[PDB]
mmCIF file of all heavy atoms in Angstrom:
data_model
loop_
_atom_site.group_PDB
_atom_site.id
_atom_site.type_symbol
_atom_site.label_atom_id
_atom_site.label_comp_id
_atom_site.label_asym_id
_atom_site.label_seq_id
_atom_site.Cartn_x
_atom_site.Cartn_y
_atom_site.Cartn_z
ATOM 1 N N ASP T 1 -7.005 3.669 0.260
ATOM 2 C CA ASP T 1 -7.838 3.851 -0.876
ATOM 3 C C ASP T 1 -8.960 2.845 -1.199
ATOM 4 O O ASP T 1 -10.074 3.221 -1.477
ATOM 5 C CB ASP T 1 -6.969 4.109 -2.123
ATOM 6 C CG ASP T 1 -6.010 5.230 -2.106
ATOM 7 O OD1 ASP T 1 -5.883 5.882 -1.008
ATOM 8 O OD2 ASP T 1 -5.259 5.420 -3.079
ATOM 9 N N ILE T 2 -8.641 1.615 -1.135
ATOM 10 C CA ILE T 2 -9.534 0.544 -1.476
ATOM 11 C C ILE T 2 -10.076 -0.166 -0.290
ATOM 12 O O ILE T 2 -11.318 -0.335 -0.158
ATOM 13 C CB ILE T 2 -8.930 -0.416 -2.424
ATOM 14 C CG1 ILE T 2 -8.511 0.320 -3.765
ATOM 15 C CG2 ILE T 2 -9.848 -1.633 -2.815
ATOM 16 C CD1 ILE T 2 -7.427 -0.335 -4.661
ATOM 17 N N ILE T 3 -9.205 -0.651 0.587
ATOM 18 C CA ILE T 3 -9.603 -1.391 1.776
ATOM 19 C C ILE T 3 -10.291 -0.586 2.811
ATOM 20 O O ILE T 3 -11.237 -1.038 3.434
ATOM 21 C CB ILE T 3 -8.522 -2.242 2.257
ATOM 22 C CG1 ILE T 3 -8.009 -3.232 1.164
ATOM 23 C CG2 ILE T 3 -8.900 -2.982 3.518
ATOM 24 C CD1 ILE T 3 -6.761 -4.045 1.425
ATOM 25 N N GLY T 4 -9.808 0.625 3.009
ATOM 26 C CA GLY T 4 -10.456 1.496 3.917
ATOM 27 C C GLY T 4 -10.093 1.257 5.349
ATOM 28 O O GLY T 4 -10.891 1.533 6.241
ATOM 29 N N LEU T 5 -8.901 0.604 5.638
ATOM 30 C CA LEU T 5 -8.423 0.348 6.949
ATOM 31 C C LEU T 5 -8.284 1.603 7.737
ATOM 32 O O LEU T 5 -8.027 2.697 7.187
ATOM 33 C CB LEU T 5 -7.090 -0.340 6.841
ATOM 34 C CG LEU T 5 -6.422 -0.588 8.162
ATOM 35 C CD1 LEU T 5 -7.271 -1.558 9.051
ATOM 36 C CD2 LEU T 5 -5.021 -1.150 7.923
ATOM 37 N N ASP T 6 -8.454 1.543 9.048
ATOM 38 C CA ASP T 6 -8.384 2.734 9.915
ATOM 39 C C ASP T 6 -6.988 3.364 9.606
ATOM 40 O O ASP T 6 -5.894 2.700 9.756
ATOM 41 C CB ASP T 6 -8.481 2.273 11.384
ATOM 42 C CG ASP T 6 -8.068 3.391 12.387
ATOM 43 O OD1 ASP T 6 -8.013 4.572 12.067
ATOM 44 O OD2 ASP T 6 -7.791 2.946 13.531
ATOM 45 N N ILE T 7 -7.012 4.619 9.313
ATOM 46 C CA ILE T 7 -5.780 5.392 8.922
ATOM 47 C C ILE T 7 -4.691 5.207 9.966
ATOM 48 O O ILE T 7 -3.505 5.172 9.746
ATOM 49 C CB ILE T 7 -6.032 6.952 8.717
ATOM 50 C CG1 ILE T 7 -4.777 7.598 8.246
ATOM 51 C CG2 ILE T 7 -6.512 7.618 10.049
ATOM 52 C CD1 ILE T 7 -4.211 7.146 6.904
ATOM 53 N N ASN T 8 -5.164 5.073 11.248
ATOM 54 C CA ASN T 8 -4.284 4.832 12.392
ATOM 55 C C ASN T 8 -3.538 3.502 12.467
ATOM 56 O O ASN T 8 -2.563 3.347 13.174
ATOM 57 C CB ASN T 8 -4.977 5.174 13.621
ATOM 58 C CG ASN T 8 -5.479 6.558 13.762
ATOM 59 O OD1 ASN T 8 -4.655 7.516 13.664
ATOM 60 N ND2 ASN T 8 -6.743 6.792 13.868
ATOM 61 N N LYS T 9 -4.082 2.623 11.596
ATOM 62 C CA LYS T 9 -3.516 1.236 11.540
ATOM 63 C C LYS T 9 -2.619 1.034 10.313
ATOM 64 O O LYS T 9 -1.784 0.226 10.346
ATOM 65 C CB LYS T 9 -4.604 0.240 11.602
ATOM 66 C CG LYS T 9 -5.513 0.354 12.803
ATOM 67 C CD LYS T 9 -4.657 0.216 14.096
ATOM 68 C CE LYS T 9 -5.640 0.411 15.263
ATOM 69 N NZ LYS T 9 -6.717 -0.622 15.187
ATOM 70 N N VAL T 10 -3.007 1.724 9.251
ATOM 71 C CA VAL T 10 -2.324 1.598 7.970
ATOM 72 C C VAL T 10 -0.772 1.372 7.921
ATOM 73 O O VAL T 10 -0.371 0.467 7.180
ATOM 74 C CB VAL T 10 -2.797 2.723 7.023
ATOM 75 C CG1 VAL T 10 -1.949 2.767 5.766
ATOM 76 C CG2 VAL T 10 -4.262 2.540 6.680
ATOM 77 N N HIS T 11 -0.040 2.151 8.620
ATOM 78 C CA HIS T 11 1.459 2.087 8.568
ATOM 79 C C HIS T 11 1.938 0.746 9.183
ATOM 80 O O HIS T 11 2.815 0.095 8.610
ATOM 81 C CB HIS T 11 2.099 3.282 9.318
ATOM 82 C CG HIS T 11 3.565 3.284 9.373
ATOM 83 N ND1 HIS T 11 4.435 3.485 8.388
ATOM 84 C CD2 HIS T 11 4.353 2.809 10.467
ATOM 85 C CE1 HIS T 11 5.631 3.246 8.781
ATOM 86 N NE2 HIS T 11 5.621 2.826 10.006
ATOM 87 N N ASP T 12 1.361 0.322 10.284
ATOM 88 C CA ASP T 12 1.856 -0.912 10.921
ATOM 89 C C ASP T 12 1.500 -2.130 10.003
ATOM 90 O O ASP T 12 2.379 -3.111 9.937
ATOM 91 C CB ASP T 12 1.251 -1.105 12.363
ATOM 92 C CG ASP T 12 1.813 0.066 13.236
ATOM 93 O OD1 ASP T 12 2.975 0.350 13.203
ATOM 94 O OD2 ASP T 12 0.959 0.626 13.896
ATOM 95 N N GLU T 13 0.399 -2.090 9.391
ATOM 96 C CA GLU T 13 -0.001 -3.205 8.485
ATOM 97 C C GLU T 13 0.952 -3.236 7.335
ATOM 98 O O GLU T 13 1.602 -4.229 6.983
ATOM 99 C CB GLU T 13 -1.440 -2.848 7.937
ATOM 100 C CG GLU T 13 -2.065 -3.975 7.161
ATOM 101 C CD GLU T 13 -2.750 -5.113 7.948
ATOM 102 O OE1 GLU T 13 -3.132 -4.775 9.060
ATOM 103 O OE2 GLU T 13 -2.823 -6.183 7.457
ATOM 104 N N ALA T 14 1.108 -2.130 6.651
ATOM 105 C CA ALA T 14 2.050 -1.991 5.448
ATOM 106 C C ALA T 14 3.478 -2.394 5.854
ATOM 107 O O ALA T 14 4.191 -2.913 5.049
ATOM 108 C CB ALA T 14 1.976 -0.560 4.890
ATOM 109 N N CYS T 15 3.881 -2.296 7.066
ATOM 110 C CA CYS T 15 5.252 -2.697 7.582
ATOM 111 C C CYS T 15 5.369 -4.140 7.430
ATOM 112 O O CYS T 15 6.532 -4.676 7.324
ATOM 113 C CB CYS T 15 5.499 -2.232 9.028
ATOM 114 S SG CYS T 15 5.786 -0.504 9.289
ATOM 115 N N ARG T 16 4.326 -4.896 7.517
ATOM 116 C CA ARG T 16 4.337 -6.352 7.355
ATOM 117 C C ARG T 16 4.130 -6.753 5.851
ATOM 118 O O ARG T 16 4.936 -7.574 5.374
ATOM 119 C CB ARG T 16 3.197 -6.990 8.161
ATOM 120 C CG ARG T 16 3.521 -7.163 9.631
ATOM 121 C CD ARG T 16 2.344 -7.709 10.381
ATOM 122 N NE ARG T 16 1.204 -6.754 10.386
ATOM 123 C CZ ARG T 16 -0.093 -7.095 10.354
ATOM 124 N NH1 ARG T 16 -0.361 -8.417 10.308
ATOM 125 N NH2 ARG T 16 -0.991 -6.181 10.470
ATOM 126 N N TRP T 17 3.248 -6.101 5.179
ATOM 127 C CA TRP T 17 2.900 -6.392 3.813
ATOM 128 C C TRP T 17 4.129 -6.028 2.906
ATOM 129 O O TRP T 17 4.230 -6.669 1.783
ATOM 130 C CB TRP T 17 1.725 -5.613 3.334
ATOM 131 C CG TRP T 17 0.392 -5.947 3.984
ATOM 132 C CD1 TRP T 17 0.274 -6.527 5.327
ATOM 133 C CD2 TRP T 17 -0.891 -5.989 3.446
ATOM 134 N NE1 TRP T 17 -1.112 -6.827 5.472
ATOM 135 C CE2 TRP T 17 -1.813 -6.449 4.403
ATOM 136 C CE3 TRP T 17 -1.398 -5.569 2.225
ATOM 137 C CZ2 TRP T 17 -3.151 -6.551 4.158
ATOM 138 C CZ3 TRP T 17 -2.733 -5.666 1.953
ATOM 139 C CH2 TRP T 17 -3.617 -6.116 2.901
ATOM 140 N N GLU T 18 4.992 -5.130 3.238
ATOM 141 C CA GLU T 18 6.067 -4.762 2.461
ATOM 142 C C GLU T 18 7.079 -5.885 2.228
ATOM 143 O O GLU T 18 7.679 -5.969 1.144
ATOM 144 C CB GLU T 18 6.810 -3.582 3.072
ATOM 145 C CG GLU T 18 7.689 -3.951 4.250
ATOM 146 C CD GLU T 18 8.156 -2.782 5.000
ATOM 147 O OE1 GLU T 18 7.600 -1.715 4.902
ATOM 148 O OE2 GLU T 18 9.193 -2.795 5.687
ATOM 149 N N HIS T 19 7.062 -6.815 2.985
ATOM 150 C CA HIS T 19 7.892 -8.041 2.862
ATOM 151 C C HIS T 19 7.255 -9.252 2.114
ATOM 152 O O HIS T 19 7.966 -10.184 1.763
ATOM 153 C CB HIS T 19 8.216 -8.566 4.268
ATOM 154 C CG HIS T 19 8.914 -7.643 5.081
ATOM 155 N ND1 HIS T 19 10.131 -7.115 4.700
ATOM 156 C CD2 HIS T 19 8.585 -7.064 6.228
ATOM 157 C CE1 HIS T 19 10.522 -6.210 5.655
ATOM 158 N NE2 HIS T 19 9.572 -6.169 6.583
ATOM 159 N N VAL T 20 5.979 -9.222 1.844
ATOM 160 C CA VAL T 20 5.297 -10.231 1.126
ATOM 161 C C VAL T 20 4.631 -9.858 -0.157
ATOM 162 O O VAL T 20 3.968 -10.676 -0.839
ATOM 163 C CB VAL T 20 4.303 -11.043 2.037
ATOM 164 C CG1 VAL T 20 5.016 -11.470 3.307
ATOM 165 C CG2 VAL T 20 3.116 -10.097 2.442
ATOM 166 N N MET T 21 4.626 -8.606 -0.551
ATOM 167 C CA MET T 21 4.016 -8.140 -1.771
ATOM 168 C C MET T 21 4.902 -8.335 -2.891
ATOM 169 O O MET T 21 6.038 -7.919 -2.845
ATOM 170 C CB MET T 21 3.596 -6.684 -1.667
ATOM 171 C CG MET T 21 2.867 -6.171 -2.859
ATOM 172 S SD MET T 21 2.374 -4.442 -2.650
ATOM 173 C CE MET T 21 1.156 -4.742 -1.303
ATOM 174 N N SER T 22 4.417 -8.989 -3.924
ATOM 175 C CA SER T 22 5.261 -9.285 -5.123
ATOM 176 C C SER T 22 5.227 -8.084 -5.987
ATOM 177 O O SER T 22 4.422 -7.287 -5.970
ATOM 178 C CB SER T 22 4.899 -10.562 -5.849
ATOM 179 O OG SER T 22 3.682 -10.478 -6.600
ATOM 180 N N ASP T 23 6.254 -8.107 -6.902
ATOM 181 C CA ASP T 23 6.395 -7.051 -7.896
ATOM 182 C C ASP T 23 5.178 -7.037 -8.792
ATOM 183 O O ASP T 23 4.718 -5.978 -9.195
ATOM 184 C CB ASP T 23 7.604 -7.360 -8.808
ATOM 185 C CG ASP T 23 8.886 -7.011 -8.168
ATOM 186 O OD1 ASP T 23 8.928 -6.634 -6.920
ATOM 187 O OD2 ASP T 23 9.988 -7.173 -8.755
ATOM 188 N N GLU T 24 4.553 -8.249 -9.092
ATOM 189 C CA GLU T 24 3.410 -8.322 -9.947
ATOM 190 C C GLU T 24 2.195 -7.625 -9.342
ATOM 191 O O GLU T 24 1.468 -6.992 -10.010
ATOM 192 C CB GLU T 24 3.046 -9.868 -10.207
ATOM 193 C CG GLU T 24 4.216 -10.716 -10.704
ATOM 194 C CD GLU T 24 5.054 -11.403 -9.592
ATOM 195 O OE1 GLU T 24 5.912 -10.801 -9.065
ATOM 196 O OE2 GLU T 24 4.687 -12.599 -9.358
ATOM 197 N N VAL T 25 2.036 -7.798 -8.036
ATOM 198 C CA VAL T 25 0.908 -7.126 -7.322
ATOM 199 C C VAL T 25 1.028 -5.668 -7.467
ATOM 200 O O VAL T 25 0.041 -4.976 -7.725
ATOM 201 C CB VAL T 25 0.825 -7.575 -5.895
ATOM 202 C CG1 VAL T 25 -0.207 -6.764 -5.117
ATOM 203 C CG2 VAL T 25 0.286 -8.993 -5.766
ATOM 204 N N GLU T 26 2.290 -5.153 -7.271
ATOM 205 C CA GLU T 26 2.718 -3.750 -7.328
ATOM 206 C C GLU T 26 2.220 -3.143 -8.748
ATOM 207 O O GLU T 26 1.833 -2.022 -8.852
ATOM 208 C CB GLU T 26 4.145 -3.490 -7.083
ATOM 209 C CG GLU T 26 4.692 -3.942 -5.762
ATOM 210 C CD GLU T 26 6.013 -3.524 -5.542
ATOM 211 O OE1 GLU T 26 6.249 -2.391 -5.094
ATOM 212 O OE2 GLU T 26 7.005 -4.302 -5.870
ATOM 213 N N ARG T 27 2.558 -3.851 -9.828
ATOM 214 C CA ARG T 27 2.247 -3.380 -11.107
ATOM 215 C C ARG T 27 0.735 -3.282 -11.273
ATOM 216 O O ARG T 27 0.162 -2.285 -11.858
ATOM 217 C CB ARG T 27 2.781 -4.351 -12.245
ATOM 218 C CG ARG T 27 4.271 -4.300 -12.187
ATOM 219 C CD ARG T 27 4.829 -5.118 -13.321
ATOM 220 N NE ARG T 27 6.258 -5.259 -13.146
ATOM 221 C CZ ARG T 27 6.888 -6.381 -12.724
ATOM 222 N NH1 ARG T 27 6.177 -7.455 -12.422
ATOM 223 N NH2 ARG T 27 8.195 -6.392 -12.481
ATOM 224 N N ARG T 28 0.066 -4.244 -10.642
ATOM 225 C CA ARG T 28 -1.437 -4.215 -10.704
ATOM 226 C C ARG T 28 -1.938 -3.028 -9.917
ATOM 227 O O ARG T 28 -2.767 -2.233 -10.325
ATOM 228 C CB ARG T 28 -2.032 -5.470 -10.062
ATOM 229 C CG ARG T 28 -1.774 -6.650 -10.961
ATOM 230 C CD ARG T 28 -2.356 -6.360 -12.307
ATOM 231 N NE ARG T 28 -3.721 -5.962 -12.234
ATOM 232 C CZ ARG T 28 -4.449 -5.354 -13.233
ATOM 233 N NH1 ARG T 28 -3.863 -5.177 -14.376
ATOM 234 N NH2 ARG T 28 -5.710 -4.983 -13.012
ATOM 235 N N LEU T 29 -1.352 -2.760 -8.671
ATOM 236 C CA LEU T 29 -1.785 -1.599 -7.886
ATOM 237 C C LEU T 29 -1.441 -0.284 -8.581
ATOM 238 O O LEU T 29 -2.305 0.685 -8.400
ATOM 239 C CB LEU T 29 -1.053 -1.706 -6.492
ATOM 240 C CG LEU T 29 -1.651 -2.756 -5.571
ATOM 241 C CD1 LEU T 29 -0.847 -2.961 -4.321
ATOM 242 C CD2 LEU T 29 -3.052 -2.494 -5.327
ATOM 243 N N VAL T 30 -0.404 -0.137 -9.292
ATOM 244 C CA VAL T 30 -0.097 1.044 -10.083
ATOM 245 C C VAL T 30 -1.199 1.276 -11.040
ATOM 246 O O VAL T 30 -1.523 2.415 -11.373
ATOM 247 C CB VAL T 30 1.125 1.010 -10.807
ATOM 248 C CG1 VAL T 30 1.341 2.297 -11.697
ATOM 249 C CG2 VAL T 30 2.371 0.950 -9.814
ATOM 250 N N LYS T 31 -1.845 0.128 -11.530
ATOM 251 C CA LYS T 31 -2.849 0.175 -12.519
ATOM 252 C C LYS T 31 -4.319 0.533 -11.855
ATOM 253 O O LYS T 31 -5.098 1.307 -12.458
ATOM 254 C CB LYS T 31 -2.956 -1.148 -13.255
ATOM 255 C CG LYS T 31 -1.894 -1.204 -14.286
ATOM 256 C CD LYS T 31 -2.002 -2.494 -15.049
ATOM 257 C CE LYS T 31 -0.952 -2.528 -16.168
ATOM 258 N NZ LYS T 31 -1.152 -3.577 -17.214
ATOM 259 N N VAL T 32 -4.629 -0.015 -10.760
ATOM 260 C CA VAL T 32 -5.868 0.117 -10.096
ATOM 261 C C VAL T 32 -6.067 1.375 -9.205
ATOM 262 O O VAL T 32 -7.075 1.872 -8.944
ATOM 263 C CB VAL T 32 -6.366 -1.113 -9.421
ATOM 264 C CG1 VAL T 32 -6.073 -2.407 -10.368
ATOM 265 C CG2 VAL T 32 -5.750 -1.360 -8.105
ATOM 266 N N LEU T 33 -4.859 1.801 -8.651
ATOM 267 C CA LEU T 33 -4.803 2.998 -7.774
ATOM 268 C C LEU T 33 -4.944 4.322 -8.598
ATOM 269 O O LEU T 33 -4.448 4.403 -9.656
ATOM 270 C CB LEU T 33 -3.526 3.062 -6.991
ATOM 271 C CG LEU T 33 -3.493 2.017 -5.840
ATOM 272 C CD1 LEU T 33 -2.124 2.027 -5.141
ATOM 273 C CD2 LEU T 33 -4.579 2.281 -4.860
ATOM 274 N N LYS T 34 -5.620 5.214 -8.055
ATOM 275 C CA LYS T 34 -5.813 6.467 -8.812
ATOM 276 C C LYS T 34 -4.615 7.340 -8.749
ATOM 277 O O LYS T 34 -4.429 8.111 -9.737
ATOM 278 C CB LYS T 34 -7.022 7.248 -8.171
ATOM 279 N N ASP T 35 -3.795 7.228 -7.750
ATOM 280 C CA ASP T 35 -2.492 7.970 -7.671
ATOM 281 C C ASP T 35 -1.408 7.293 -6.847
ATOM 282 O O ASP T 35 -1.614 7.016 -5.703
ATOM 283 C CB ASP T 35 -2.864 9.357 -7.102
ATOM 284 C CG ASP T 35 -1.653 10.224 -7.039
ATOM 285 O OD1 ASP T 35 -1.017 10.196 -5.943
ATOM 286 O OD2 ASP T 35 -1.355 11.004 -7.939
ATOM 287 N N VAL T 36 -0.260 7.072 -7.456
ATOM 288 C CA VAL T 36 0.829 6.482 -6.767
ATOM 289 C C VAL T 36 1.924 7.431 -6.527
ATOM 290 O O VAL T 36 3.111 7.038 -6.339
ATOM 291 C CB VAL T 36 1.332 5.182 -7.564
ATOM 292 C CG1 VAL T 36 0.234 4.102 -7.451
ATOM 293 C CG2 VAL T 36 1.555 5.504 -9.036
ATOM 294 N N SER T 37 1.669 8.668 -6.463
ATOM 295 C CA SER T 37 2.715 9.765 -6.332
ATOM 296 C C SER T 37 3.276 9.708 -4.903
ATOM 297 O O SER T 37 4.506 9.741 -4.767
ATOM 298 C CB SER T 37 2.135 11.170 -6.503
ATOM 299 O OG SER T 37 1.176 11.204 -7.501
ATOM 300 N N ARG T 38 2.403 9.750 -3.959
ATOM 301 C CA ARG T 38 2.845 9.742 -2.532
ATOM 302 C C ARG T 38 2.060 8.723 -1.694
ATOM 303 O O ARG T 38 1.127 8.081 -2.173
ATOM 304 C CB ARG T 38 2.556 11.143 -1.897
ATOM 305 C CG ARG T 38 3.720 12.174 -2.032
ATOM 306 C CD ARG T 38 3.983 12.518 -3.510
ATOM 307 N NE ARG T 38 5.127 13.430 -3.599
ATOM 308 C CZ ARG T 38 5.740 13.615 -4.733
ATOM 309 N NH1 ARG T 38 5.494 13.019 -5.880
ATOM 310 N NH2 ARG T 38 6.820 14.458 -4.792
ATOM 311 N N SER T 39 2.502 8.453 -0.500
ATOM 312 C CA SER T 39 1.941 7.580 0.464
ATOM 313 C C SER T 39 0.852 8.369 1.113
ATOM 314 O O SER T 39 0.642 9.581 0.912
ATOM 315 C CB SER T 39 2.887 7.042 1.467
ATOM 316 O OG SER T 39 3.326 8.088 2.296
ATOM 317 N N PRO T 40 0.047 7.758 1.920
ATOM 318 C CA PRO T 40 -1.060 8.548 2.606
ATOM 319 C C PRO T 40 -0.368 9.590 3.630
ATOM 320 O O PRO T 40 -0.970 10.551 3.991
ATOM 321 C CB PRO T 40 -1.838 7.472 3.422
ATOM 322 C CG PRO T 40 -1.647 6.319 2.533
ATOM 323 C CD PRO T 40 -0.254 6.288 2.212
ATOM 324 N N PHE T 41 0.888 9.230 3.958
ATOM 325 C CA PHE T 41 1.645 10.041 4.969
ATOM 326 C C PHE T 41 2.594 11.059 4.412
ATOM 327 O O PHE T 41 3.533 11.552 5.103
ATOM 328 C CB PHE T 41 2.318 9.066 5.938
ATOM 329 C CG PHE T 41 1.356 7.967 6.441
ATOM 330 C CD1 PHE T 41 1.516 6.616 6.176
ATOM 331 C CD2 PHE T 41 0.133 8.321 7.162
ATOM 332 C CE1 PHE T 41 0.618 5.669 6.652
ATOM 333 C CE2 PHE T 41 -0.737 7.405 7.579
ATOM 334 C CZ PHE T 41 -0.483 6.008 7.256
ATOM 335 N N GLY T 42 2.383 11.555 3.150
ATOM 336 C CA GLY T 42 3.232 12.598 2.588
ATOM 337 C C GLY T 42 4.574 12.329 1.909
ATOM 338 O O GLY T 42 5.269 13.310 1.586
ATOM 339 N N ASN T 43 4.963 11.018 1.854
ATOM 340 C CA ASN T 43 6.215 10.675 1.193
ATOM 341 C C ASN T 43 6.051 10.112 -0.189
ATOM 342 O O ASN T 43 5.035 9.374 -0.451
ATOM 343 C CB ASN T 43 7.037 9.698 2.073
ATOM 344 C CG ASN T 43 7.495 10.370 3.338
ATOM 345 O OD1 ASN T 43 7.083 10.029 4.419
ATOM 346 N ND2 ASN T 43 8.461 11.293 3.146
#
């Protein structure tokens, strides 16, 4: 949505970020993201 990373790379990147993203950043993302219902991959 924001960074625009190649869709084909997105999952592998997030696999790393999932371990270092704090709860605080997440609250911010729920605020700045237009929709937090699903991931780009349907889940």
Side-chain angles (χ1 to χ4, degrees), residues 1-33 35-43:
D1 302 359
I2 300 157
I3 297 169
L5 174 62
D6 169 19
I7 186 60
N8 294 306
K9 302 305 180 50
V10 170
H11 177 77
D12 297 316
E13 185 86 26
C15 287
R16 281 181 287 149
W17 292 32
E18 77 191 21
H19 301 299
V20 305
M21 179 177 297
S22 73
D23 287 2
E24 307 94 277
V25 168
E26 299 187 86
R27 292 185 191 106
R28 289 307 306 167
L29 289 173
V30 171
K31 283 182 179 197
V32 317
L33 286 178
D35 181 272
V36 291
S37 325
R38 272 61 185 164
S39 66
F41 313 115
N43 289 113

